[PDB]
Curated annotation (Swiss-Prot), chain A:
ATP 1 binds at S32, G33, T34, G35, K36, T37, L38, S73, K194, L195, R196, T198, H200. Its EC number is 2.7.11.1, 3.6.4.-. The lineage of its organism: Bacteria, Bacillati, Cyanobacteriota, Cyanophyceae, Acaryochloridales. This is Circadian clock oscillator protein KaiC. The interaction with KaiA enhances its phosphorylation status, while the interaction with KaiB decreases it. Mg(2+) 1 binds at T37. Belongs to the KaiC family. The modification Phosphothreonine is found at T391. It comes from Thermosynechococcus vestitus (strain NIES-2133 / IAM M-273 / BP-1). Changing S390D: 1.5-fold decrease in SasA autophosphorylation.
Curated annotation (Swiss-Prot), chain B:
GO terms for molecular function: ATP binding; ATP hydrolysis activity; DNA binding; identical protein binding; kinase activity; magnesium ion binding; protein serine kinase activity; protein serine/threonine kinase activity. Homohexamer resembling 2 stacked donuts rings with a central pore nearly blocked on one side; hexamerization is dependent on ATP-binding. Binds 2 ATP per monomer, at the subunit interface on each ring. The KaiABC complex composition changes during the circadian cycle to control KaiC phosphorylation. Complexes KaiC(6), KaiA(2-4):KaiC(6), KaiB(6):KaiC(6) and KaiC(6):KaiB(6):KaiA(12) are among the most important forms, many form cooperatively. Interacts with SasA, probably as 1 SasA trimer:1 KaiC homohexamer, has highest affinity for unphosphorylated SasA. NCBIfam families: circ_KaiC, PRK09302.1. Binds 2 Mg(2+) ions per subunit, one in each domain. Mg(2+) is required for hexamerization and phosphatase activity. Changing K36H: KM for ATP is 13 uM, reduced hexamerization. KM for ATP is 3.4 mM, very little hexamerization. Coiled coil: none annotated. It comes from the Bacteria. One of its GO terms (biological process) is regulation of DNA-templated transcription. The lineage of its organism: Bacteria, Bacillati, Cyanobacteriota, Cyanophyceae, Acaryochloridales. Changing K255H: KM for ATP is 3.6 uM, reduced hexamerization. KM for ATP is 3.4 mM, very little hexamerization. This is Circadian clock oscillator protein KaiC. Residues 1-214, 222-458 form the KaiC domain.
Length: 456, 458, 452
């Protein structure tokens, strides 16, 4: 089969099923600021630092000094690698005031530094004539047995692969970087279009730029901090579960999240809250009016609240920020209030990808996850979520209003509990200064789940 | 690693995380009338006035005197800066240039340069590429920070003109002027900053005090009155001073009456109240309000009440938001009302509407101003939704007004549906409208299906 | 009359009704990485290995060493065929080229020729001159051409397709963020062919309603359900278990897999919602040891995320797992996870494809569907696949005296009597215990009944 070398770019070696085909050129194509120079630098940097494989970077516009200065923001010390004879940056930029000769310089540098990896950025800038030129360069690098990245420009996100509609047909390997405007938000994706003679995953995969390009179960029980709800769940929530609290505006979801967080903290565990609707001040005032002291928990270093606006960032960026804070603070409990705030004005496919990411990540770290969903219908709603994420969750707590004798009551139901028995009751509950008080089912009523029951 | 210098353009140093990379070119591209020359002038003006950094402005078309005259509409006095040798405008217009720019950078000790516009010179895409590279390289050599402005024909087509400029520059900024139905919406995007961080995608802005690009709020237990005794008891002692109140229900239920009481009660405590009315004139508002003994005309001429009447269709949402922000800043209300959010929502995208609501509500809470917003529902009975715009979760207290068919007549009932941080009455209370205003009575304890609008007596 | 020579590329000879017109040029057009070189190579490889017909491969860019090394990934040993003088790779990396092609054809007595690729007004006469010379020599020719677009010009210059007697378009289409491979036979002058696009995958080269039906019964693994279905599921059937989140679809899957393995039969599960760990834990609550059944080699579970591959590629994985493991029983948990954010037409082709493969292999299929509406649903599935299935189990929530109860109906049962009851069931430690219908209620199917 066709042998591959690891890029060690995070997630890339998975989508390429091993890395880039050894001894061949890969075209990396994309619009301006897609991450082309980034991929090309990371390739050489990882080659040297992880595999002691020397590298040539050929630039046709940017100055060596600018390549080195840019890489500093990632903590990559390119100058050190130059001083060790591991990295050579070959300046092929034009005069501030041909072809055969360039191919000869690159060969001298390859043999002198004993380089196995080469990046060229960008061959677009040194330009049927284009076709034969990429072919000649690619031919000589193959003969010398190096693995090459050639970056190309493009103007349109979903039009031609490169610029002259020829490059991709010459290259054995084609990677496309995209930066797609989804409404007013940008979404970064990598695609492996083609790898001759070998396998790769197909279509677009999300990625972020942070630190370079970035593409188990148990019977253990854990408390909600509501005594009666623990009973209703069969002895409590599972430690390795995703919990969904869903229902109409004002029902009591933020109350249930408050109790979840506080309970982990009084067991001396850390809890992490991502709030997308309310400020820290308001969360704390409301919480104090339920008998919960978020301020004391915060002082003791047990509770961290991250407040952010959904429409401030793209979903992939929200997920990266979530992964970073978990890796840093190392919680045993994570809460999202609300998933429905993050779903507003985004494709359901983008949102479902986000939800699969957050929940996958929580279940890998064996973190207990509590997520809220506010329904659009305040009554008579025949669905758990409008985003159809039900099948991604282990436990579902249905909160709903019920008209009783001319007043708006409210009931709680453990709708789903994978792995355990649960109470089937639609149990009336009351909110007070002590938080949630759960009472009995409405025995002598029909049509409770409609919101407008009838006395039997 | 890459250091930035402050632009002090309102909101830009936030999306750039500190401003523009020092010692490099930033491309600012846009269609005609997007704010490019404005951005270029403001970079130099703020450099001089705020950090004593001198600047060169290169024009290839516009006269110096027209650049100076145009800045005076923002109260920027460029001539005094030119008198002091802190600003120099280089006329490169029709009846090499690198030579002249470098002479001026030395002579004025300039650390900031604006070139407006680099398109007007440019023929071959290879010609423009090599030309923009040489200019950028010579300016970087001198150690100055540059903005080069560029033209485009399309809002979502090429970054620039020859599909090459954006690849040469270290830094690209796109100013857009999008037609959304018949309304224009200005946005700014940092596409790329080599070697550093930036916020991604488009941010709304307006042009008022130059370019103006626009969850850490306070929260108290302080109560304020609604002007309706029984409603204050239903809300557990009053509205919260730090809250957003939504009054929602079908046409004619009594939302505007509840706004009139909210505002009247503030003035009665000698506080300023501010009303934005998108459906009715001052004269109609005043006549209807006098039905309850409220004299809006006396409250206006004594400077306690200010009523702003406008049609939603007369401006884009971002410009409505600008008028609300500056009216709150001038008049300094304790209470602000919008009548109605439903009026502003029609024939605009849900995404742009929710952006507007986050913005007005977020700014009211920031300044600890009590906000009261109305929403008229499209279904006058049997509605299973609070709003069709789904803004419920952005509001703290929700008042639901509804019609209820009783004995072949249309009665109305009021419910405190939601009250963050307090107990509230759960009753669906019948009310009647008379000269006393809203008279709230008992819930209908003998009926089922009240919330459907067509009850059944048991 | 036009005669065809067989390609023996899986599925090509059916859509072409025999193969490629003999003695003529077929144009194979596509964007980059559509399978053009793969097609041109397979044509020659299949000719030499199956029909002993010598071939010439003419390359204008790729080196012979690359073509040979690339073909090794499928275990096609092109070197041994070159060493036997059955294959010649002509390196052209126009009058002069035709000379060497003629000489080669004569020297090797070749009937098949691939030219890859001819892209590397004047083109029209060039392609015509080339196609003409090969027609006089009696060879059947593949000519590969490059496109810029998926639904734009057939080739590059807007003439190649008008000169060729036969045109084939390979597409690699972006549907949301997933790629879908299709082959279309646009035209074959002087003969018949199937019309429009046909799905394919690259697995062993290019891979592009008449089954048996017995009265043999198999157990659901739940006694009462076997009686409700009139003595068990049919061996030759597709079972759809459909209903709201948490009704017990996965429990029914676990029973159906277990009872198979406990008879010494192999079962295969495709899981798209839950990990092996969560599946095993939940299953061990009802006394099922998936790990043990796997250990004994009677169970195999495949866990994947829907969003990870396209549906053509999921269907390929399912077909190769069945071919390898040879199950009596197969489960998909769930079809609703696969339907999310793909087109309904794409989803339906996937369903017809997987049900057709189970049915022609005599494999009992058990698929789950979760309904979006948890109560009062007027439909079996939102995707409307009911008519592709033989047995339908409807699981639904029923409000009884302020509590959420559960009911099961055998809704359809092609070929057999079935119970008409909407029967209450409870999930306990013993699994699913099915009880009686609510005979004193009205509107049970609404989920909010009234006591009569
Ligand atoms: N330290 C950093 N942290 C976060 N993001 C960064 C960092 N450094 C760079 N970036 C991001 O990476 C981008 C630079 O990508 P890169 O230089 O690879 O672009 P490119 O594809 O080569 O563009 P062009 O074709 O214009 O040269 C910046 O636009 C920025 O968004
Ligand atoms: N001190 C209190 N006494 C009684 N009830 C209270 C008290 N404080 C809050 N509540 C109740 O809690 C409700 C708010 O609960 P919570 O914030 O958890 O709702 P939610 O479902 O998160 O709503 P949303 O997300 O739509 O804002 C109030 O509307 C009120 O009914
Ligand atoms: N004093 C002012 N108050 C409010 N808006 C103003 C004021 N002065 C200018 N503007 C707005 O700014 C616009 C001009 O911005 P600017 O001159 O930067 O455009 P530009 O992008 O440079 O256009 P062109 O490419 O045609 O030169 C005016 O069309 C007007 O809408
Ligand atoms: N003098 C009055 N006496 C009694 N009822 C009155 C009087 N004036 C107005 N009303 C009642 O108040 C209603 C108007 O109240 P208001 O303007 O607040 O309604 P609204 O919900 O804001 O209406 P819209 O949907 O048109 O904006 C009338 O339809 C009527 O029922
Ligand atoms: N052994 C293999 N197993 C699986 N997939 C493979 C294998 N070898 C090749 N592929 C797939 O086939 C593709 C190669 O197709 P092919 O070489 O025919 O492309 P093409 O249409 O000729 O493109 P171009 O015109 O750029 O040369 C790769 O992109 C990869 O997706
Ligand atoms: N040990 C147990 N004892 C009693 N009931 C249990 C037990 N374990 C699970 N359950 C019940 O079984 C349900 C889970 O069944 P199952 O996982 O098959 O549902 P599903 O229809 O596949 O759900 P989903 O929609 O999540 O795929 C729980 O919600 C609960 O009602
Ligand atoms: N031997 C039998 N005894 C009793 N009922 C039977 C028997 N065979 C079939 N049935 C009944 O006939 C039904 C199938 O009838 P038929 O296939 O004609 O339905 P259909 O409406 O065409 O269904 P589809 O939607 O699948 O096309 C079974 O669900 C069952 O009710
Ligand atoms: Mg670059
Ligand atoms: Mg909440
Ligand atoms: Mg201008
Ligand atoms: Mg009104
Ligand atoms: Mg090829
Ligand atoms: Mg399941």
């Amino acid at each position: 089969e066709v042998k591959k070398i690891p890029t060690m770019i995070e997630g890339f070696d998975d989508i390429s099923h091993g890395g880039l085909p050894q001894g061949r050129t890969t075209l990396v194509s994309g619009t301006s600021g897609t991450g082309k120079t980034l991929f090309a630098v990371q390739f050489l940097y990882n080659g040297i630092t992880i595999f002691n494989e020397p590298g040539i970077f050929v630039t046709f516009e940017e100055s060596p000094q600018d390549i080195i200065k840019n890489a500093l923001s990632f903590g990559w010390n390119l100058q050190s690698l130059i001083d060790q004879g591991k990295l050579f940056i070959l300046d092929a930029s034009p005069d501030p005031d041909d072809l055969s000769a360039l191919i000869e310089r690159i060969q001298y540098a390859i043999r002198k530094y004993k380089a196995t990896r080469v990046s060229i950025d960008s061959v677009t800038a040194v330009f049927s004539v284009v076709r034969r030129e990429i072919f000649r360069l690619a031919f000589r690098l193959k003969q010398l047995g190096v693995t090459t990245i050639m970056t190309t420009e493009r103007v349109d996100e979903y039009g031609p692969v490169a610029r002259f509609g020829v490059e991709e047909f010459v290259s054995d390997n084609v990677v496309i970087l995209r930066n797609v405007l989804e409404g007013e938000r940008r979404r970064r994706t990598v695609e492996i279009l083609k790898l001759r003679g070998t396998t790769h995953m197909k279509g677009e995969y999300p990625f972020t730029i942070n630190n370079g390009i970035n593409i188990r179960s148990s019977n253990v029980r854990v408390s909600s901090g509501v005594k009666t709800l623990d009973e209703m769940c069969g002895g409590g929530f599972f430690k390795d579960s995703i919990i969904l609290a869903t229902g109409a505006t004002g029902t009591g979801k933020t109350l249930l999240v408050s109790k979840f967080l506080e309970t982990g903290c009084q067991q001396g565990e850390r809890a992490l809250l991502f709030a997308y609707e309310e400020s820290r001040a308001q969360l704390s005032r409301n919480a104090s009016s339920w008998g919960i002291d978020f301020e004391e928990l915060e002082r003791r270093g047990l509770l961290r609240i991250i407040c952010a606006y959904p429409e401030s960032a793209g979903l992939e960026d929200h997920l990266q920020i979530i992964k970073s804070e978990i890796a840093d603070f190392k919680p045993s409990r994570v809460a999202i209030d609300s998933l429905s705030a993050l779903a507003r004005g985004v494709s359901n496919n983008a949102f479902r990808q986000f939800v699969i990411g957050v929940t996958g990540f929580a279940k890998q770290e064996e973190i207990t996850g509590f997520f809220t969903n506010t329904t659009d219908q305040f009554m008579g709603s025949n669905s758990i979520t409008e985003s159809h994420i039900s099948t991604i969750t282990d436990t579902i707590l249905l909160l709903q209003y019920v008209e009783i004798r001319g007043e708006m009551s409210r009931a709680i139901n453990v709708f789903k509990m994978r792995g355990s028995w649960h109470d089937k009751g639609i149990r009336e509950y009351v909110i007070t200064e002590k938080g949630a008080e759960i009472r009995d089912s409405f025995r002598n009523f029909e049509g409770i789940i409609s919101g407008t029951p009838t006395r039997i």
